[PDB]
Motif scaffolding. Sequence first.
Motif, PDB file in Angstrom:
ATOM      1  N   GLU A   6       0.809  -1.127   0.000  1.00 49.09           N
ATOM      2  CA  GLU A   6       0.000   0.000   0.000  1.00 49.09           C
ATOM      3  C   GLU A   6       0.888   1.237   0.000  1.00 49.09           C
ATOM      4  O   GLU A   6       0.371   2.288  -0.291  1.00 49.09           O
ATOM      5  CB  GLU A   6      -0.971   0.002   1.168  1.00 49.09           C
ATOM      6  CG  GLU A   6      -1.016   1.277   2.020  1.00 49.09           C
ATOM      7  CD  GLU A   6      -1.238   0.995   3.526  1.00 49.09           C
ATOM      8  OE1 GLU A   6      -0.609   0.096   4.085  1.00 49.09           O
ATOM      9  OE2 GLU A   6      -2.026   1.662   4.176  1.00 49.09           O
ATOM     10  N   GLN A   9       0.774   1.547  -3.896  1.00 49.52           N
ATOM     11  CA  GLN A   9      -0.499   1.976  -4.500  1.00 49.52           C
ATOM     12  C   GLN A   9      -0.838   3.420  -4.257  1.00 49.52           C
ATOM     13  O   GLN A   9      -1.664   3.988  -4.903  1.00 49.52           O
ATOM     14  CB  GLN A   9      -1.647   1.139  -3.850  1.00 49.52           C
ATOM     15  CG  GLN A   9      -3.069   1.717  -3.929  1.00 49.52           C
ATOM     16  CD  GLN A   9      -3.817   1.735  -2.599  1.00 49.52           C
ATOM     17  OE1 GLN A   9      -3.327   1.196  -1.634  1.00 49.52           O
ATOM     18  NE2 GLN A   9      -4.978   2.390  -2.542  1.00 49.52           N
ATOM     19  N   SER A  13      -0.159   5.530  -6.900  1.00 52.20           N
ATOM     20  CA  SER A  13      -1.356   6.316  -7.146  1.00 52.20           C
ATOM     21  C   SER A  13      -1.455   7.838  -6.929  1.00 52.20           C
ATOM     22  O   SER A  13      -2.535   8.297  -7.168  1.00 52.20           O
ATOM     23  CB  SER A  13      -2.570   5.676  -6.530  1.00 52.20           C
ATOM     24  OG  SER A  13      -3.652   6.303  -7.115  1.00 52.20           O
TER      25      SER A  13
END
Length: 282
Positions: A6, A9, A13
Amino acid sequence: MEMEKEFEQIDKSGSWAAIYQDIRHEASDFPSRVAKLPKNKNRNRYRDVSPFDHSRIKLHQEDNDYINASLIKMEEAQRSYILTQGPLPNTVGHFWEMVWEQKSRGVVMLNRVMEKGSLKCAQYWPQKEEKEMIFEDTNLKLTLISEDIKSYYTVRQLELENLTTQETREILHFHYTTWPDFGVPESPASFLNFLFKVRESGSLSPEHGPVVVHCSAGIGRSGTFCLADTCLLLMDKRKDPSSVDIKKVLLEMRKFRMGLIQTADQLRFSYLAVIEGAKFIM
Ligand SMILES: N#Cc1ccccc1O
């Protein structure tokens, strides 16, 4: 989710001011009535940073027992920290009264005296062995004993006595001095390395009082070190290692003191620290 995936991401992201903002708003907002008393107005370094009434460290004096500081209890991990602001010219005696009183072994200083062209705190420790300092108000004497200057940090051994009374406790001061003016360091290896140094001192352990930790407001940088520290702790101790969630931990710390982790640059950095420290934790 394994934070490392994460972290990805999130960084893949483009979203930290995204997650920072989500943390902010969901944080706690307790009362801080003591700190706004008029009578206490000079004792605060900043207008927007104060200690909550419930978790404040209370000076044991008849007159005014207020200091802008807060006790941070991480239950599962079994660590308590004293977070605070950089002492002010006029609260230096109160600073050392509270180290004496709470039984701490260590001060961890994460800023320099003059940062960005301004004074971020009073130089509250003696610069030379030969010229000790006396805090006549709180009836305490402070004396530099020894002092090791390294590349990234400085370590000092000091002695705190009660003038009034004849007790001497030795105090160790861990000073981080190489955090750039703007942002956060480009690698966390230096920061991890200083943390560990502090862990080796006895300075963060149970047979002692809680370590006092501070920057200029006591929230940004201090929040970072602590957070890293508590998290490594938990992965260390659990049957279940990626069952350690920084955010939920951060929010827990936040129950005790306001605004810890001041920017999204610092959250993210928080996560690196942690991940890189979680390869030793082998
Ligand atoms: N340590 C710790 C901790 C973190 C989050 C929630 C509860 C806890 O005891």
